[PDB]
């Protein structure tokens, strides 16, 4: 939970600094400063490691060819006045703007489609960082975009400490070292800047350790299918 | 090109869109009951036992 | 054809004759003397073995001729005709001498198998 | 895959309701049939509206003060 | 192929029209609601203005 | 939004500096200083990464052979007195001078044309940094220039903090480090100049990280078509 | 515009120096000092990058063999008393002495001519840095010299701040770093000279970055025509 | 057939003719002179034996 | 591509209007026909202008005080 | 050379240029209605039912 | 080929002349406008000086 | 070859002599200038000392 992370930061890592309040808990006024750094740390960990991969269904409309990955066009977000909401969200999968990289794209039946392929004029291109361009949209089709997902963003004004930070206990130290590095690096004092650099190096060492141990089952080899494809 | 009409996603989403009606049916089945009326006693018999509430109009 | 085109592309698209000269090598007069073709005189900070470079076409990899030969060897093994060859198959049609017929190898028999059919066609024309 | 993932994604918490409805589907058909033939006693809250009801509504109860 | 969940969903989907008709008929006209005890009568929604109770 | 970026700069990165106002928000007088640096940062990120690619239609006129990529000749910009507006803008695609590199050029039917090719006397040459020279213009034709696009420039006098900064959350830190580097490098103090250099190095490390992870799907390989072209 | 450049220099880059006036705008007395450095920066960028290429028509006269590239001999410059004005300028192309390098030379029909070729006695030689020598001038001919062009020089006494500085937004930082380097390098103070050297190195790094990304479409390869010339 | 296809893949998918030129080698005029086919003149900080590279197909391994 | 991108680029927010017009295109043709034959009752705000109307305007309503 | 007359861009842009007239048609269809007048009752019948406002001039 | 949006746009484009004629006729002469209730009469633009209302 | 702009320029150039003669005749002798309304008469240059106006 966020309370545990705040206590851990207050005593042990952010101890000899103002934000830690001498190990008596993070002040209720410095929340929008640890939370901003925490969002960056969670984004870094969720982009460098595959801690959350999710899929989103994009319903194709006859007059729309550029589909934006924004919650304003979501089926569950009822606050938006968009006439056509092509994102197909469910109470289970909500699509809270947590998109880090669009990896794979499928169709309604389940056949993979090419992504960003120029020679094949049947591929789904990506114009901008959050858009999906379908040159050939059909009113009776739906996409099945799968992406690497981010942690649901914790608002800067969040006050409830029961908001759960969903990271494995192995990356707790990596996140904490990242937060310490980011908070220690703001000041231009050489002595404090050196500590910030040391925290950055230690965070990059923890990440290297987790990569070397593959605690998230990311770098796992697959069955070779090249002989079958080449006709052996 | 191929039009995907009646696939698994279509059926599941059609069921999902009608979840309010399904919940209403569940509540009607489990909570209360309706009064089913027939014309004669013969029909009362020709009625399934799930009709625990019956009214017969006779001359 | 593809391997021949690749060889020609390696030999042709290169620079055969384009000679580069280092900019800070020769002064105004010595550059003219070198261009004319006489002896030149270079500065003490440059080396002639590095300042002047004449480009030549890169050597064709030995794999391309090997593939050309291999695909020209898998054709002579499928049809049966092999470039300049000594053939008896044209002299072994019909009732011939035993010595002539006794020098029939596999390629000659392959070439005679078509000659007999072509002669059967002519015989069928002659009967008509 | 037997398409159970789609059911979880869309009917995740309402699967009990869906299964209960599917269990009593015969009684659902029976209840669908009765209502269709106005076989249920329709109730109105006043007069001058019992006439507005279809002639097939043979059975009616009228409320008055 | 054992698609038990999908089999249930498809079986419900094949009879979805009956559910739609039932919901429309019950929300359009208004029928008599019968409840066994006085308790569920109070637990009935206020939308059912017409109620009947069977007791012994 | 711009408010979130200003708060993040004020507390955490631009903390021990005047512009941060000791972590109480950027002053309403220092806006035209963070905005000037923010425009440079957005331009750098949008030029080094393909965060926005857009197309513009250029209608050819019989008497015009040099077509300038300026909004003064736009169809939607009604403030300009130009007799011939050959840029074909729409409410969707507006062409707000956000051109970083002219990459590809097509025709009305959709056949690619050569760009800056000298031997082919049918190619569209580029005289200046914002011009398109058509040696053979036809009154019944239109171009389909596609370019890498920049973020719509935020005016130096902008006061509304609801102007949205459209960058992915992964490049938020890269942009913030760039802003810190630019603001810290103005002073000639060796101690502050060292911090500015460190911020520049950290920005160039974040950019290298994003390049190594390809979070924008930029360095993706394509299907090989050389055997087909060479006749294999 | 020049006003935006002056403001950007005043706050952010020329901040801790006299010319910046502590970030309150460049003084109206220091204009002829930023403008002199700005002209040098624009010349450097326009000579190292092809930001402006222009052509000029030189009409040949029977008695003139050395043609000077000066506005005194221009057709539009009516202030000069020259009897023969062989430069053929138009309201569109004005030839404001903005010549950086004479690259290509053509004829009236459009056939390229050799430049500075000694063996061919039909080539246009260049005696001085601004002259064009035609050993064989004909009264009924005209040249079509094409050169890399400079930014129209901003006068040292310029007071109107609406004079537009035509550079792409990607080279804005390069120009600003160059101006900072030039202004910081005048003083012989070792501490300030080090900052000037750092600005020079950063300018040369920005130029290297733009060269590596080819934002001006300069280093683009051309179609190979050597097989056709060699008779393959 | 598989070995022949592998040999053709090694010989074909490569770059036979694609010649790379170092960006900071020749100025604007010398680049044109080199493209035309005449003699060029390179800067004092670059080497022709390293700036210009013409790709050739890698040799097929003797094992195939 | 089925040229849907062009429709989105130019008719992005007016596609509802365009589709509604296309739906009633037969009634659009009918309304085009009636007007053509002055089949509608033309109204003028005063006299000495009803004469300025084409002779085909068989039906007119004049406004006067 | 090739002249591009009547292509997809031309049709789409021609429709876009006439968007004001299309919007006027939509407003005329959805908001209000016009009075359509005929000469005889026979014609009232020969008129489509979309004419909800009719006036007949008779002798 | 399913160009539904382009099919609709082309079908509208083929009858664009009728729309132009209708707009020109309605903006040139001025006809009688009939509205069902008094409400949309007020919601009518002021350019329609001539109005008729049908009520019961 | 579609040189529309050059076609227009060449067509004008072929009749340039007529334009030169017209300009010389109008600037040499001085003819009567006729203007429809009184407005363009005032907007006429002062070089036209001779004017005539047609009104109803």
Q: 């280093």: which residue's tokens?
A: G219
Q: In Å, what is the CA distance from A37 to each residue of A186, A189, A191, F177, H21? A: 11, 20, 21, 13, 45
> How far apart are the C-alpha atoms of F161 and F175, rounded to whole Å?
17
The distance in angstroms from the start CA to the end CA of chain H is 11
Tokens of C110: 């392959």
Q: 């209605």: which residue's tokens?
A: J33
- The reply to whether J25 touches chain K by the CB within 8 Å rule is yes
> How far apart are the C-alpha atoms of A80 and A68, rounded to whole Å?
14
> How far apart are the C-alpha atoms of H47 and H36, rounded to whole Å?
20
Provide DSSP, F112-133.
EE-BS-SSSTT-BB--STTEEE
Residue closest to G195 by CA, chosen among G25, G22, G186: G186
Query: Would you give the distance in Å from CA K36 to the centre of its chain?
Result: 16
Query: Chain G residue closest to F126 (CA)?
Result: G217
> How far apart are the C-alpha atoms of A72 and A85, rounded to whole Å?
8
What sections of chain C are H helices per DSSP? 2-12, 28-36, 48-51, 63-71, 98-101, 106-127
Q: Which chains touch K (3 or more CB pairs under 8 A)?
A: A, B, I, J
Measured CB to CB, residues of chain F less than 8 Å from chain G are: 32-33, 36-37, 39-40, 43-44, 47-48, 100-102, 115-120, 126-130, 150, 153, 156, 182-183, 185-190, 193, 197
Residue closest to F42 by CA, chosen among F132, F131, F163: F163
Probe site for chain F from H4, H10, H13, H31 (most F CB atoms < 10 A):
H13
Query: Which residues of chain F does A187 touch, with a Cβ-Cβ cutoff of 8 Å?
Result: 15-16
> How far apart are the C-alpha atoms of A134 and C79, rounded to whole Å?
52
Question: Which residues, listed in sequence order, are joined to residue C22 by a DSSP beta bridge?
Answer: H42
Probe site for chain G from H23, H26, H30, H54 (most G CB atoms < 10 A):
H23
Question: Which residues, listed in sequence order, are joined to residue G149 by a DSSP beta bridge?
Answer: G99
- The reply to whether D53 touches chain B by the CB within 8 Å rule is no
CA distance H52 to chain C (A): 9
Q: What share of chain I is helix, strand, coil (3-state, %, to 5)?
A: 45, 10, 45
> How far apart are the C-alpha atoms of K19 and J21, rounded to whole Å?
6
> How far apart are the C-alpha atoms of D27 and D31, rounded to whole Å?
6
> How far apart are the C-alpha atoms of F152 and F99, rounded to whole Å?
10
> How far apart are the C-alpha atoms of A10 and A30, rounded to whole Å?
11
Tokens of C2: 């593809």
Q: Are C14 and C55 in contact (CB under 8 A)?
A: yes
Resolution as reported, in Å:
3.5
> How far apart are the C-alpha atoms of F169 and A130, rounded to whole Å?
11
Probe site for chain A from D10, D11, D13 (most A CB atoms < 10 A):
D10
Probe site for chain C from H14, H48, H62 (most C CB atoms < 10 A):
H48
- Judged by 3 or more CB pairs under 8 A, whether L touches H is no
Q: For I4-65, list the strands marked E by DSSP.
A: 42-44, 60-62
Q: What is the β-pairing status of strands G142-149 and H19-21?
A: unpaired
Q: Are C15 and C55 in contact (CB under 8 A)?
A: yes
Number of alpha helices (DSSP H) and beta strands (DSSP E) in chain A:
5, 7
Which residues does A7 contact at the CB level (< 8 Å), separation at least 6?
A25
Query: Which residues of chain I does A135 touch, with a Cβ-Cβ cutoff of 8 Å?
Result: 1-2, 4-5
Query: Would you give the distance in Å from CA C65 to the centre of its chain?
Result: 7
CA distance H35 to chain C (A): 10
Q: Are J12 and K10 in contact (CB under 8 A)?
A: no
Provide the phi-psi class of B6: left if phi over 0, else alpha when psi is between -120 and 50, else beta: left
| Cβ burial, residue E29 (10 Å; 0-12/13-18/19+) | middle
Q: What is the β-pairing status of strands J36-38 and J54-56?
A: parallel
Measured CB to CB, residues of chain L less than 8 Å from chain F are: 2, 4-5
> How far apart are the C-alpha atoms of K27 and L3, rounded to whole Å?
41
Angle between helices B19-30 and D25-36 (to 10 degrees): 90
> How far apart are the C-alpha atoms of G43 and G21, rounded to whole Å?
26
Q: Phi, psi (5° rounding) for residue G213?
A: -90, -15
Q: Are A141 and A60 in contact (CB under 8 A)?
A: yes
SS3 string of G85-154? CCEECCCCCCCCCCEEEEEEEECCCCCEECECCCCCCCCEECCCCCEEECCCCCCCCEEEEEEEECCCCC
Residue closest to A150 by CA, chosen among A75, A67, A71: A71
> How far apart are the C-alpha atoms of B4 and B10, rounded to whole Å?
9
> How far apart are the C-alpha atoms of G173 and G196, rounded to whole Å?
15
Q: Are G177 and G209 in contact (CB under 8 A)?
A: no
Residue closest to E27 by CA, chosen among D26, B54, B51, D35: D35
The distance in angstroms from the start CA to the end CA of chain D is 62
What sections of F87-186 are H helices per DSSP? 172-184
> How far apart are the C-alpha atoms of F88 and D10, rounded to whole Å?
44
Residues G5, G7, G9, CA angle at the centre, nearest 5°?
Answer: 70
DSSP for residue F22: G
Query: Would you give the distance in Å from CA A4 to the centre of its chain?
Result: 22
> How far apart are the C-alpha atoms of I17 and J15, rounded to whole Å?
12
DSSP for residue F49: S
Query: Which residues of chain B does A88 touch, with a Cβ-Cβ cutoff of 8 Å?
Result: 13
Which residues does L56 contact at the CB level (< 8 Å), separation at least 6?
none
Angle between helices E16-28 and B19-30 (to 10 degrees): 70
Helix (H) or strand (E) holding F54: strand F53-59
Which residues does I63 contact at the CB level (< 8 Å), separation at least 6?
I43, I44, I45, I46, K50
Q: How many residues does chain C have?
A: 128
Q: Are D22 and B25 in contact (CB under 8 A)?
A: no
> How far apart are the C-alpha atoms of E48 and E45, rounded to whole Å?
6
Candidates J4, J13, J16; nearest CB to F141: J4
Query: Which residues of chain F does I12 touch, with a Cβ-Cβ cutoff of 8 Å?
Result: 90-92
SS3 string of chain D? CCCHHHHHHHHCCCHHHHHHHHHCHHHHHHHHHHHHCCCECEEECCCCCCCCCCCCCCCEEECCC
- The reply to whether H24 touches chain G by the CB within 8 Å rule is yes
Q: Phi, psi (5° rounding) for residue A66?
A: -115, 110
Angle between helices I15-23 and I25-36 (to 10 degrees): 70
Provide the phi-psi class of J40: left if phi over 0, else alpha when psi is between -120 and 50, else beta: beta
Tokens of A152: 């649901």
Provide the phi-psi class of C42: left if phi over 0, else alpha when psi is between -120 and 50, else beta: beta
CA distance F228 to chain C (A): 11
Q: In Å, what is the CA distance from A162 to each residue of A46, A159, G75, H61? A: 21, 9, 80, 64
Q: Are A87 and A73 in contact (CB under 8 A)?
A: yes
Q: Which chains touch B (3 or more CB pairs under 8 A)?
A: A, D, E, K
Provide the phi-psi class of K7: left if phi over 0, else alpha when psi is between -120 and 50, else beta: alpha
DSSP for residue K22: H
Question: Which residues, listed in sequence order, are joined to residue C101 by a DSSP beta bridge?
Answer: none
Q: How many residues does chain B have?
A: 59
CB count in 10 Å sphere of residue K14:
11
DSSP-based three-state secondary structure for K53: strand
Q: Are C123 and C117 in contact (CB under 8 A)?
A: no
DSSP for residue K47: T
Query: Would you give the distance in Å from CA F11 to the centre of its chain?
Result: 28
Q: Are G151 and G98 in contact (CB under 8 A)?
A: yes
Q: In Å, what is the CA distance from I64 to each residue of C65, I61, J26? A: 104, 10, 32
| Cβ burial, residue F83 (10 Å; 0-12/13-18/19+) | exposed
> How far apart are the C-alpha atoms of B19 and B13, rounded to whole Å?
10
Angle between helices D15-23 and D4-11 (to 10 degrees): 110
Which residues does F14 contact at the CB level (< 8 Å), separation at least 6?
A186, F20, F26, F179, F180, F183
Q: What is the β-pairing status of strands A131-133 and A66-68?
A: antiparallel
DSSP-based three-state secondary structure for A132: strand
Dihedral (C-alpha) G1, G2, G8, G14: value to the nearest 10 degrees?
160
DSSP for residue G72: G
Question: Which residues, listed in sequence order, are joined to residue F28 by a DSSP beta bridge?
Answer: none
> How far apart are the C-alpha atoms of J1 and J5, rounded to whole Å?
13
Query: Chain H residue closest to G230 (CA)?
Result: H37
Q: For J1-59, list the strands marked E by DSSP.
A: 33-34, 36-38, 54-56
Number of alpha helices (DSSP H) and beta strands (DSSP E) in chain H:
3, 3
Which residues does G179 contact at the CB level (< 8 Å), separation at least 6?
G9, G13, G14, G34, G37, G38, G41
Which of A61-97 are b and which e, b meaning 16 or more Cβ less than 10 Å from the residue's Cβ?
bbbbbbbebbbebbbebeeeeeeebbbbbbeebbbbb
Candidates D2, D35, D53; nearest CB to E6: D2
Residues A197, A203, A205, CA angle at the centre, nearest 5°?
Answer: 105
Q: Are F29 and F18 in contact (CB under 8 A)?
A: no
Query: Would you give the distance in Å from CA F226 to the centre of its chain?
Result: 32
Residue closest to D57 by CA, chosen among E32, J1, I27: E32
Query: Which residues of chain H does A229 touch, with a Cβ-Cβ cutoff of 8 Å?
Result: none
J29/I20 CB distance under 8 A: yes
Q: Are I32 and I42 in contact (CB under 8 A)?
A: no
Tokens of F71: 């909004």
- The reply to whether J22 touches chain I by the CB within 8 Å rule is yes
Tokens of A77: 């977000």
Q: Phi, psi (5° rounding) for residue A210?
A: -65, -35
Measured CB to CB, residues of chain F less than 8 Å from chain L are: 62-63, 138-139
> How far apart are the C-alpha atoms of G208 and G220, rounded to whole Å?
16
> How far apart are the C-alpha atoms of F55 and F49, rounded to whole Å?
17
E34/B34 CB distance under 8 A: yes
Q: Are F102 and F126 in contact (CB under 8 A)?
A: yes
Helix (H) or strand (E) holding A35: helix A31-48
Q: Are F153 and F97 in contact (CB under 8 A)?
A: yes
Q: Phi, psi (5° rounding) for residue L5?
A: -60, -45
Q: Are G222 and H33 in contact (CB under 8 A)?
A: no
Which of D35-48 are b and which e, b meaning 16 or more Cβ less than 10 Å from the residue's Cβ?
beebbbbbbbeeee
Handedness of CA G20, G26, G28, G29 (dihedral sign): positive
> How far apart are the C-alpha atoms of H4 and H11, rounded to whole Å?
11
> How far apart are the C-alpha atoms of A41 and A179, rounded to whole Å?
7
DSSP-based three-state secondary structure for C18: coil
Question: Which residues, listed in sequence order, are joined to residue G102 by a DSSP beta bridge?
Answer: G147
| Cβ burial, residue A5 (10 Å; 0-12/13-18/19+) | buried
**Interrupted after residues, chain I (C–N over 2.5 Å):** none
Helix (H) or strand (E) holding A58: strand A53-59
Residue closest to G219 by CA, chosen among H51, F68, C63, A227: H51
Q: In Å, what is the CA distance from G39 to each residue of G12, G46, G59, G211? A: 20, 10, 30, 21
Q: Are L33 and L51 in contact (CB under 8 A)?
A: yes
Q: In Å, what is the CA distance from G54 to each residue of A85, G40, G57, G108, J35? A: 51, 20, 10, 16, 66
> How far apart are the C-alpha atoms of C64 and C7, rounded to whole Å?
7
Experimental technique for the deposited model: cryo-EM
CB count in 10 Å sphere of residue B9:
21
DSSP for residue A23: G
Tokens of G168: 């792409």
CA distance L54 to chain F (A): 34
- Judged by 3 or more CB pairs under 8 A, whether D touches B is yes
């Amino acid at each position: 939970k966020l309370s545990e992370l705040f206590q851990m930061l207050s005593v042990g890592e952010l101890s000899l600094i103002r934000t830690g309040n001498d190990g008596q808990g993070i002040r209720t006024q410095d929340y929008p400063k640890v939370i901003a750094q925490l969002n960056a740390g969670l984004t870094n960990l969720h982009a460098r490691f595959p801690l959350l991969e999710k899929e989103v269904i994009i319903q194709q409309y006859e007059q729309i060819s550029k589909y934006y990955l924004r919650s304003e066009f979501a089926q569950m977000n009822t606050t938006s006045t968009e006439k056509y909401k092509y994102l197909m969200d469910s109470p289970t999968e909500r699509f809270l703007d947590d998109v880090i990289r669009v990896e794979r794209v499928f169709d309604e039946c389940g056949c993979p489609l090419y992504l960003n392929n120029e020679p094949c004029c049947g591929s789904i291109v990506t114009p901008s960082f959050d858009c999906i361009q379908i040159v050939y949209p059909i009113e009776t089709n739906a996409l099945f975009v799968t992406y690497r997902a981010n942690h649901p963003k914790i608002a800067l004004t969040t006050t409830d400490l029961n908001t759960e930070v969903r990271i494995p206990a192995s990356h707790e130290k990596a996140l904490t070292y990242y937060i310490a590095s980011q908070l220690y690096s703001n000041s231009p004092n050489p002595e404090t800047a050196a500590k910030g650099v040391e925290w950055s190096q230690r965070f990059e060492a923890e990440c290297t350790k987790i990569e070397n141990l593959d605690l998230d089952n990311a770098h796992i080899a697959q069955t070779n299918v090249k002989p079958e494809m080449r006709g052996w | 090109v191929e039009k995907f009409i009646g696939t698994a996603y279509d059926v599941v989403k059609t069921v999902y869109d009608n979840l309010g009606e399904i919940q209403f049916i569940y509540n009607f089945l489990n909570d209360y009951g309706v009064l089913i009326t027939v014309d004669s006693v013969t029909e009362l018999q020709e009625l399934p036992t799930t009709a625990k509430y019956t009214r017969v109009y006779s001359s | 054809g593809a391997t021949t085109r690749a060889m020609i592309d390696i030999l042709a698209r290169s620079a055969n004759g384009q000679t580069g000269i280092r900019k800070d090598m020769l002064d105004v007069t010595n550059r003219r003397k070198f261009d004319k073709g006489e002896d030149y005189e270079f500065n003490a900070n440059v080396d002639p073995r590095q300042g002047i470079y004449m480009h030549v076409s890169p050597e064709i990899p030995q794999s391309a001729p090997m593939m050309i030969q291999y695909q020209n060897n898998e054709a002579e093994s499928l049809t049966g005709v092999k470039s300049f060859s000594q053939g008896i198959a044209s002299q072994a049609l019909g009732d011939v001498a035993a010595g002539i017929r006794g020098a029939l190898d596999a390629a000659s028999k392959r070439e005679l198998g078509i000659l007999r059919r072509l002669a059967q066609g002519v015989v069928e024309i002659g009967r008509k």
